């Protein structure tokens, strides 16, 4: 029965958002389809990968008939996207085919029963809060580069989301470097901490358009839900005990360095050219008001950069993966950086010299 006629512009962003969780090589064919449901004056569109789902609701201002089906996602999006601006897309189901008509364009797509479409299991929310999309995008953007990709420690292949007092915090680490960002959200929250999978952090990130809707978060025991306007994202959580970030932050650093973010970045970036392609190690020599960065490779090529910095303390030599340092400096889109050290075998804390909302911890290399 299912019938609806909707404007092209009312389907485009929804079809692109619900196709988000979809992988290129689905294990089950239905997993490459979108669930279409007409109920009352609403059309709902769902996309899943079993670990996460995206739902979009579209208001039906034209005659429609209730029903459901599943239809190949990329093909349906491409048909809609390909139609002219303002096109009126008339959809109707004709057995195991869903007909799409607009102007003199006609398409017949193959369907899979709506009844076969996968459901995420029901759950109970424990923590609920609202925040501007921009706060969530800045919390993610500040830390995401530090998550592990496909680590042994599967609880690192994601980002920790932690609530404490009136703050939302994200932590991301791969065991070699860490990133932590905290933002006040204006609401008192119960202390809760969950691990969001890296694929879900990416999906959550992509649903943050810009505004005229706040973000409503619901955290459960094994799920996280994000509502933004007419979109609802749900993800399963990572079942693991995230390591404590509060113990990896240098407990009492005695050495403090200050430098211009861009001059420090540009030197590291030049020294990196002549560092080992695989290991990317650079040497840092700190002495009174000066930093020397050296790099060399198996070919015995060498780079050296000398900089004026604000440093008063003991001279020290420390090794680093230059990519981890460059990642931090490019994250810190600021004027000045503060580096806090202890010794050559211990982590360094890097932050904006004028903001503590984000802090980065990089573990050294020996030579």
């Amino acid at each position: 029965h299912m019938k609806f006629t909707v404007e092209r512009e009312h389907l485009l962003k929804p079809l692109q958002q619900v196709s988000g969780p979809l992988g290129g090589r689905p294990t089950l064919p239905i997993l490459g389809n979108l669930l279409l449901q007409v109920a009352d004056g609403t059309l709902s569109l769902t996309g899943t990968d079993l670990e996460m789902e995206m739902v979009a609701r579209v208001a039906l201002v034209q005659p429609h008939e209730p029903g459901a089906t599943t239809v190949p996602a990329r093909k349906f999006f491409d048909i809609c996207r390909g139609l002219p601006e303002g096109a009126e897309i008339a959809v109707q189901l004709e057995g195991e085919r869903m007909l799409v008509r607009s102007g003199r364009s006609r398409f017949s797509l193959s369907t899979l029963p709506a009844a076969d479409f996968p459901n995420l299991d029901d759950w109970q929310s424990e923590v609920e809060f609202t925040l501007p999309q921009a706060t969530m995008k800045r919390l993610i953007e500040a830390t995401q580069f530090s998550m592990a990709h496909q680590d042994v420690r599967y609880y690192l292949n994601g980002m920790l989301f932690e609530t404490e007092g009136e703050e939302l915090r994200t932590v991301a680490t791969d065991g070699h470097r860490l990133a932590v960002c905290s933002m006040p959200i204006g609401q008192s929250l119960p202390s809760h901490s969950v691990i969001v999978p890296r694929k879900g952090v990416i999906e959550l990130m992509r649903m943050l358009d810009g505004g005229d809707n706040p973000l409503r978060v619901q955290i459960g025991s094994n799920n996280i839900r994000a509502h933004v306007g007419d979109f609802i994202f749900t993800s399963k959580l990572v079942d693991g005990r995230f390591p404590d970030y509060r113990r990896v932050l240098p407990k009492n650093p005695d050495k403090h360095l200050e430098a211009g973010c861009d001059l420090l970045k540009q030197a590291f970036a030049r020294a990196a050219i002549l560092s080992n392609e695989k290991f990317r190690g650079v040497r840092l020599y700190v002495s009174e008001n000066q930093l020397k960065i050296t790099a060399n490779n198996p070919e015995q090529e060498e780079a050296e950069e000398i900089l004026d910095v604000t440093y008063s303390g003991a001279e020290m030599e420390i090794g680093f993966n230059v990519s981890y340092v460059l990642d931090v400096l490019n994250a810190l889109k600021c004027e000045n950086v503060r580096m806090m050290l202890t010794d050559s075998v211990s982590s360094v804390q890097i932050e904006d010299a004028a903001s503590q909302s984000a802090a980065y911890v990089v573990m050294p290399m020996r030579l």
């Binding site: 680490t173 065991g175 070699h176 470097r177 860490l178 390591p243 990896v248 290991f279 190690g281 090794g319 993966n321 075998v345 982590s347 911890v361 573990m363 050294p364 290399m365 020996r366 030579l367």
Partner: peptide, 6 residues
Amino acid sequence: XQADLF
């Protein structure tokens, strides 16, 4: 290396 945080 390289050393680990944890």
